[PDB]
Amino acid sequence: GCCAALAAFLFEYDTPRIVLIRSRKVGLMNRAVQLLILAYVIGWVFVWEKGYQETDSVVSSVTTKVKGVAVTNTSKLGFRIWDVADYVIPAQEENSLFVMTNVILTMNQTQGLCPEIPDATTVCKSDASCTAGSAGTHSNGVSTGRCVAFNGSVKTCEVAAWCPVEDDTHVPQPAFLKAAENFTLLVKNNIWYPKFNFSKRNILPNITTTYLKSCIYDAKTDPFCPIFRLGKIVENAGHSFQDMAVEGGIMGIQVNWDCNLDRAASLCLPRYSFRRLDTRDVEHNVSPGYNFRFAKYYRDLAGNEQRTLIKAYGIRFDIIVFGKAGKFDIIPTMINIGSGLALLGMATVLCDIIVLYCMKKRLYYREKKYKYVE
Amino acid sequence: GCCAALAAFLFEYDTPRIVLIRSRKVGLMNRAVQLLILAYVIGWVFVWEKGYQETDSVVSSVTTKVKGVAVTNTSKLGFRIWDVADYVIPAQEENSLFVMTNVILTMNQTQGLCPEIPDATTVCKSDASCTAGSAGTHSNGVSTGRCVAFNGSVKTCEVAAWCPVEDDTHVPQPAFLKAAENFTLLVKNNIWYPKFNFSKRNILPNITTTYLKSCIYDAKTDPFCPIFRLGKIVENAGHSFQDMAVEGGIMGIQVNWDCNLDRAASLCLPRYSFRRLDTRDVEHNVSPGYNFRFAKYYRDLAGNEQRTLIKAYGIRFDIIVFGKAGKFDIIPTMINIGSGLALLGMATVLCDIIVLYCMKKRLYYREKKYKYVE
Amino acid sequence: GCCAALAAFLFEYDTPRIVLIRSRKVGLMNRAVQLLILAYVIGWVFVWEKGYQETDSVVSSVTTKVKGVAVTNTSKLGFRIWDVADYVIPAQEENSLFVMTNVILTMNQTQGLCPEIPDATTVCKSDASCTAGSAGTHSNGVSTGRCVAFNGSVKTCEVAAWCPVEDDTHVPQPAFLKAAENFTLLVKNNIWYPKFNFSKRNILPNITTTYLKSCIYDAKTDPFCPIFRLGKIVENAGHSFQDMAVEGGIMGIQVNWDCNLDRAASLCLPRYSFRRLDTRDVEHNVSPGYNFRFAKYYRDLAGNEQRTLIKAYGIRFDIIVFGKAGKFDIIPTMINIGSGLALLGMATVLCDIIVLYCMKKRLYYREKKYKYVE
Numbered sequence A, B, C: 001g002c003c004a005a006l007a008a009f010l011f012e013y014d015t016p017r018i019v020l021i022r023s024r025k026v027g028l029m030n031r032a033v034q035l036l037i038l039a040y041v042i043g044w045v046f047v048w049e050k051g052y053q054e055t056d057s058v059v060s061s062v063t064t065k066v067k068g069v070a071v072t073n074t075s076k077l078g079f080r081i082w083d084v085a086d087y088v089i090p091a092q093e094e095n096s097l098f099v100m101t102n103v104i105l106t107m108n109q110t111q112g113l114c115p116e117i118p119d120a121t122t123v124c125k126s127d128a129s130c131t132a133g134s135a136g137t138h139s140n141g142v143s144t145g146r147c148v149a150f151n152g153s154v155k156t157c158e159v160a161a162w163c164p165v166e167d168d169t170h171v172p173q174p175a176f177l178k179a180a181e182n183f184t185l186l187v188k189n190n191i192w193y194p195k196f197n198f199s200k201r202n203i204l205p206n207i208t209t210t211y212l213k214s215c216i217y218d219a220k221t222d223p224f225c226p227i228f229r230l231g232k233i234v235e236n237a238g239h240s241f242q243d244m245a246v247e248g249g250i251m252g253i254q255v256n257w258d259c260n261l262d263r264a265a266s267l268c269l270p271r272y273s274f275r276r277l278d279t280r281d282v283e284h285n286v287s288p289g290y291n292f293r294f295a296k297y298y299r300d301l302a303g304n305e306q307r308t309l310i311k312a313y314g315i316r317f318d319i320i321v322f323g324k325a326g327k328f329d330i331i332p333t334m335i336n337i338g339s340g341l342a343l344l345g346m347a348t349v350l351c352d353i354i355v356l357y358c359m360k361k362r363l364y365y366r367e368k369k370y371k372y373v374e
């Protein structure tokens, strides 16, 4: 009878048979282990580590602006002005901004043949050591194989390059644009959690326009002003701005958006920290500091090309936005509940071992617990 | 006998003893709860949320190109041409592209001393309010401490800057390059899932060269043409291009690559949406819109430096590529199967509570279920 | 008595009753399935796939520098020098670097009216086909509606553009800057795992300054030199540099930082691979290769604007840094242990099916296992 079998399946309840052993020590140990498992599963997995939540990584867009002007007026270059259009190269970058702090300039370079800067490698005599096509470490020009006179006292290998070649052996000390220490950087950050489709920007709802006109970030007094002074950025990373400005470097401004979207959106707040991203190691490094070369191009009255070559040392400020949002989800919750239910059986296993192998009456309990089918 | 014990361990099967209670209500409730747990575990965890899959985040590379030219011919600037080399600054960017839509120009600036633009802060009389070294909000020059004549009717504080200083108090209305509304942007996207080592590009296999010569993206008619009109990009985000072009802004073009790699690769398709990334808030904002300054550098016949300063307003288009791929994995599958097996015992727990504490014959069932070892 | 009930709850141990069936086949199958589940849970989940670890994605910062100079000296352009400031456009980029390998130049362009380059679309006669405002495919200028003479033998539509218009119909072959094959690229990479707060850079502790002065990356001999030759980068991706240099392309240099932070930090090492990111498909592509336009701006003696337009073909090198770190965590460990404990019951289920439905004495075992409460 299939119908009778189905009715029996539906209208009967099956529960296991249990043996109740009266022992203070074993019972207390069983309860202690069960309490130890429950405390783990609740306090650590759920309350502490939030095992009931799904997570999503942040999607960020950043806008950066620098303010400040430096005035130098020396003999070689004369009176010079350095505003934002002069010391920010290139005009725009993604999640980054370079500020020039030291400079070496070479004005009126033309394409042609010229001697190199005298040193151990380039200095020559009799046009014998020079090798055609050898660019050398400079890699600024291609050697023509001839050995010409740099000046009245030394002879160097001739190269095909923009001439005269740059001389970068004397980096200015202190940094040329050392006034950049008091420039200020604004960081505007818009974040997005696509999974929860949640958006926020780092200028909080209580941060007004009047306040943003004169604020400077401070970890204690102004923890949410998005305007940072460069010297203070370097100082908060554990370094010195004047030391770092001579040869340049990389500075990380990292924004943490760890948020709990179970609570009010007003508590999803950014946290700022600062970390130097380049390393000082004179024995395990190549191209220390931070610099690059760019040029300004001109034209002679006859149409011949001329350029000013700039070797720009400076600090690159990288904006690093990271963080995870969390919202309650039923799948991790049920996974953890089932895991705890399964783990509650380790107490039974351990107590069975004790009852059956480390007891005086273990044979009696073995007889009571196990039935041999014969 | 160790061998006898091992044989007993290997050649015996152990199964629990079960009590079968005949009750329609309790049995039906047991089956209902078991069915409720099975339906959860299958339908929600496996079928709906794909709990049998491992996931991997996308690695993306983007190439962007703009097409279009604008012709303006006014009195101050005369006849001007704006092609791609003029309104895209810088020539290249990563996952981004800036299009200039409004402009303020200052031609023939030289480094020197000049008065500021008259306003409440800068206007002065008798050379008393001026403070040396105070850059002011302009931060375009350093105040020299002298109060000089801007013109015949007002006196302002003298600054060391590129002179004459920029006057950005009258932003053109409507936008200067308002013809950028009909420029078109091409977005080429190559994606990579390293875990599954799967690659695809957003130009699908059925998208031909002839079609790509004249297509424009439409959510309904051309959902896979990677060529977007700028005005339409802004419109699909819920905004107006002409309004946004006066002061600039940030526009997000986000590409979603949510794919199921259990199926054919032909179904891994990109989905396009548009979202404005900057905020309009006159009470809780600093530096609204989007603009930056860059310069073109020239040289006098005597070698003196001159520059044209450009304050460029425009819209930055950010390409945001996100998504996760999914493939069947055995580890999550077995974790979910074990979790469901463990969770099936909640029905037993609940039915035991009912049988032992909320029944008329609960004492009889308690006697039948539990054995006291004495 | 509540106290008596509590004492009974605390001082009693409950364990299930078991039926022991003596059968070689069923017992052996039970043990085989249990061993098969244990081998899975240990070997695959724990030992092989490291199911006892939490993971974290890498946060990376990259610095790139190119070295090399090319000398060309032809008739149209004359003697030219191309150093780093000439062929890297823009001076700086994020996680990227473009090297120019082919070039088309247009010198002395002025804003005005000029004919187009003769072709099927532009050629005209009698000033009838020309349409005012139609930018055309060139989109370099706006058509004025007039049909003027390109030269003595053909007439084309007049446009408002920078004049004369660029002629990009003859891309140089072989590439103009084909000497870029032996340029070298340095990639400095600093990584950070915020969850474990672990930092490392790709210049390893045993990589000295003397070694870095002359090393070139090789997968077999120098697997940790961060200096790559461009031609070799393209070759290791399965392509030819000279072929790729004519029209340009995108090359991916991907750094893998898969590390196990349970072990010494000295074993967290970078792995380098190379993949071309652009596709060759003459039937399913738009804008093949890789190129962009930028200009150098000059000024006439009268102050009129002039520019040199450069169409730059080249290879964009993208630095793709990915990887996950792993450290032992107790939560995944306990989840997997509980899952295995739950999964160990499938053996009992299967063996019960066999014992109760596929046995000669199945009725006797059914009587021994199940108790009917009456």
Ligand SMILES: *[C@@H]1O[C@H](CO)[C@@H](O[C@@H]2O[C@H](CO)[C@@H](O[C@@H]3O[C@H](CO)[C@@H](O)[C@H](O)[C@@H]3O)[C@H](O)[C@H]2NC(C)=O)[C@H](O)[C@H]1NC(C)=O
Residues within 6 Å of the ligand: A204, A206, A207, A211, A220, A221, A222, A223, A224
């Ligand atoms: C805008 O709303 C935010 C969110 O609540 C306010 O942030 C709060 O700012 C105060 C100080 O401005 C913080 O108190 C400080 O705590 C540190 C210890 O970390 C202590 O050293 C300082 O002396 C000071 O007491 C407060 O912690 C912070 N709230 C949170 C949740 O971080 C903010 O004040 C509001 N207004 C502005 C202008 O930001």
Ligand SMILES: *[C@@H]1O[C@H](CO)[C@@H](O[C@@H]2O[C@H](CO)[C@@H](O[C@@H]3O[C@H](CO)[C@@H](O)[C@H](O)[C@@H]3O)[C@H](O)[C@H]2NC(C)=O)[C@H](O)[C@H]1NC(C)=O
Residues within 6 Å of the ligand: B204, B206, B207, B211, B220, B221, B222, B223, B224
């Ligand atoms: C190339 O292959 C793709 C992949 O199948 C084709 O995509 C399909 O495109 C059609 C229209 O071109 C879509 O139909 C449209 O559906 C919307 C509703 O979302 C409706 O409003 C429209 O009127 C139209 O019926 C179709 O959904 C879409 N397939 C998928 C899976 O999204 C494409 O058509 C092929 N050819 C080209 C030139 O893209």
Ligand SMILES: *[C@@H]1O[C@H](CO)[C@@H](O[C@@H]2O[C@H](CO)[C@@H](O[C@@H]3O[C@H](CO)[C@@H](O)[C@H](O)[C@@H]3O)[C@H](O)[C@H]2NC(C)=O)[C@H](O)[C@H]1NC(C)=O
Residues within 6 Å of the ligand: C204, C206, C207, C211, C220, C221, C222, C223, C224
């Ligand atoms: C610095 O420390 C690293 C870390 O151990 C050293 O890496 C080791 O480099 C050698 C060769 O320089 C590798 O051996 C090579 O193995 C390949 C097979 O993949 C074989 O084809 C080669 O012939 C060679 O035997 C070795 O695998 C590698 N160690 C690891 C863990 O990858 C490095 O040598 C040290 N010094 C320098 C200058 O890098």
Ligand SMILES: CCCCCCCCCCCCO[C@@H]1O[C@H](CO)[C@@H](O[C@H]2O[C@H](CO)[C@@H](O)[C@H](O)[C@H]2O)[C@H](O)[C@H]1O
Residues within 6 Å of the ligand: A020, A021, A041, A336, A337, A338, A339, A340, A341, A344, B349, B353, B356, B370, C008, C009, C010, C012, C013, C014
């Ligand atoms: C996220 C966490 C996941 C884990 C969740 C765990 C929830 C599990 C609930 C289990 C409920 C146990 O339910 C209760 O168990 C005890 C033993 O413990 C039973 O009690 C039984 O054994 C005890 C101990 O020997 C005897 O004193 C008693 O006479 C006998 O009835 C109760 O009759 C039953 O009502």
Ligand SMILES: CCCCCCCCCCCCO[C@@H]1O[C@H](CO)[C@@H](O[C@H]2O[C@H](CO)[C@@H](O)[C@H](O)[C@H]2O)[C@H](O)[C@H]1O
Residues within 6 Å of the ligand: A345, A346, A348, A349, A350, A352, B014, B016, C016, C031, C032, C034, C035, C341, C344
């Ligand atoms: C190749 C030769 C064979 C290789 C053999 C591989 C090893 C096989 C032995 C694995 C034995 C697993 O042992 C199995 O453990 C579970 C608990 O997990 C016991 O389960 C029983 O007792 C435990 C406590 O002891 C309770 O928590 C549980 O509710 C109850 O059902 C089973 O009665 C036993 O069969």
Ligand SMILES: CCCCCCCCCCCCO[C@@H]1O[C@H](CO)[C@@H](O[C@H]2O[C@H](CO)[C@@H](O)[C@H](O)[C@H]2O)[C@H](O)[C@H]1O
Residues within 6 Å of the ligand: A008, A009, A010, A012, A013, A014, B020, B021, B041, B336, B337, B338, B339, B340, B341, B344, C349, C353, C356, C370
């Ligand atoms: C991803 C999902 C994970 C969860 C997977 C769950 C699979 C578990 C399979 C369990 C199989 C149960 O197997 C079947 O159980 C029923 C009770 O339910 C037993 O039936 C027993 O109890 C019932 C109910 O009181 C009585 O009517 C019957 O006389 C008695 O034999 C069957 O003898 C056994 O064959």
Ligand SMILES: CCCCCCCCCCCCO[C@@H]1O[C@H](CO)[C@@H](O[C@H]2O[C@H](CO)[C@@H](O)[C@H](O)[C@H]2O)[C@H](O)[C@H]1O
Residues within 6 Å of the ligand: A016, A031, A032, A034, A035, A341, A344, B345, B346, B348, B349, B350, B352, C014, C016
């Ligand atoms: C400090 C003082 C002590 C602190 C004590 C901490 C709490 C300890 C009590 C936790 C009790 C857990 O209770 C335990 O639950 C499981 C189900 O999960 C029961 O398990 C038994 O009955 C349930 C249904 O009721 C079945 O699903 C299961 O197959 C069967 O083995 C155990 O018989 C019981 O011992």
Ligand SMILES: CCCCCCCCCCCCO[C@@H]1O[C@H](CO)[C@@H](O[C@H]2O[C@H](CO)[C@@H](O)[C@H](O)[C@H]2O)[C@H](O)[C@H]1O
Residues within 6 Å of the ligand: A349, A353, A356, A370, B008, B009, B010, B012, B013, B014, C020, C021, C041, C336, C337, C338, C339, C340, C341, C344
């Ligand atoms: C990450 C992995 C997670 C899974 C971990 C599994 C650990 C579980 C440990 C279970 C321990 C089982 O513990 C052991 O089980 C066997 C059966 O297997 C019991 O043995 C019982 O059944 C066998 C088989 O019919 C009989 O031969 C024997 O007379 C009887 O006592 C032992 O008395 C008990 O000590």
Ligand SMILES: CCCCCCCCCCCCO[C@@H]1O[C@H](CO)[C@@H](O[C@H]2O[C@H](CO)[C@@H](O)[C@H](O)[C@H]2O)[C@H](O)[C@H]1O
Residues within 6 Å of the ligand: A014, A016, B016, B031, B032, B034, B035, B341, B344, C345, C346, C348, C349, C350, C352
């Ligand atoms: C709408 C009509 C009703 C819809 C019904 C939905 C289906 C309900 C039936 C699901 C039955 C689940 O069946 C349940 O399986 C577990 C194992 O998983 C059995 O559990 C028992 O036997 C198995 C082996 O067979 C052992 O591993 C386990 O330790 C023991 O407790 C239960 O005795 C049985 O009740």
Ligand SMILES: *[C@@H]1O[C@H](CO)[C@@H](O[C@@H]2O[C@H](CO)[C@@H](O)[C@H](O)[C@H]2NC(C)=O)[C@H](O)[C@H]1NC(C)=O
Residues within 6 Å of the ligand: A073, A074, A079
């Ligand atoms: C920059 O410094 C130079 C001197 O180093 C200044 O030029 C001199 O200024 C003094 C004081 O006014 C005069 O007496 C000299 O005649 C000036 N010329 C020289 C060659 O010394 C110069 O003025 C400074 N820059 C500015 C903007 O004033």
Ligand SMILES: *[C@@H]1O[C@H](CO)[C@@H](O[C@@H]2O[C@H](CO)[C@@H](O)[C@H](O)[C@H]2NC(C)=O)[C@H](O)[C@H]1NC(C)=O
Residues within 6 Å of the ligand: A178, A179, A180, A181, A182, B133
């Ligand atoms: C950055 O600004 C500080 C002031 O905030 C400068 O230090 C002060 O300079 C003035 C002169 O301009 C002195 O009178 C003060 O004694 C200095 N110290 C303080 C605490 O005010 C500092 O020189 C600036 N950095 C530069 C110019 O590189």
Ligand SMILES: *[C@@H]1O[C@H](CO)[C@@H](O[C@@H]2O[C@H](CO)[C@@H](O)[C@H](O)[C@H]2NC(C)=O)[C@H](O)[C@H]1NC(C)=O
Residues within 6 Å of the ligand: B073, B074, B079
């Ligand atoms: C830009 O507009 C100006 C006028 O605003 C044009 O110059 C005038 O054009 C008219 C019509 O041909 C002439 O009669 C005038 O003599 C021109 N000069 C002036 C000062 O008005 C100018 O032609 C326009 N740009 C172009 C490219 O044509």
Ligand SMILES: *[C@@H]1O[C@H](CO)[C@@H](O[C@@H]2O[C@H](CO)[C@@H](O)[C@H](O)[C@H]2NC(C)=O)[C@H](O)[C@H]1NC(C)=O
Residues within 6 Å of the ligand: B178, B179, B180, B181, B182, C133
């Ligand atoms: C962008 O293009 C549209 C056309 O697609 C321009 O609007 C049309 O302009 C022409 C004149 O060129 C008028 O005759 C039409 O009536 C206009 N509307 C339509 C629907 O065609 C629009 O002006 C352009 N945007 C600019 C120039 O900023």
Ligand SMILES: *[C@@H]1O[C@H](CO)[C@@H](O[C@@H]2O[C@H](CO)[C@@H](O)[C@H](O)[C@H]2NC(C)=O)[C@H](O)[C@H]1NC(C)=O
Residues within 6 Å of the ligand: C073, C074, C079
């Ligand atoms: C670039 O090539 C040209 C010729 O193609 C060189 O100019 C000629 O060089 C020869 C050999 O010295 C002379 O005899 C000719 O008088 C030169 N002029 C011409 C018009 O041919 C030129 O020298 C080469 N570039 C450099 C830097 O030498």
Ligand SMILES: *[C@@H]1O[C@H](CO)[C@@H](O[C@@H]2O[C@H](CO)[C@@H](O)[C@H](O)[C@H]2NC(C)=O)[C@H](O)[C@H]1NC(C)=O
Residues within 6 Å of the ligand: A133, C178, C179, C180, C181, C182
């Ligand atoms: C890149 O460098 C290689 C050498 O490493 C050049 O090939 C050699 O060129 C020299 C002449 O300069 C010849 O004598 C050799 O026979 C060539 N082969 C070898 C194996 O040395 C190659 O021409 C360079 N690429 C360029 C110039 O595009």
Ligand SMILES: *[C@@H]1O[C@H](CO)[C@@H](O)[C@H](O)[C@H]1NC(C)=O
Residues within 6 Å of the ligand: A118, A150, A151, A152, A153, A154
């Ligand atoms: C020539 O140059 C070298 C190196 O710069 C220098 O040491 C030497 O004094 C110079 N000779 C003269 C006469 O200036």
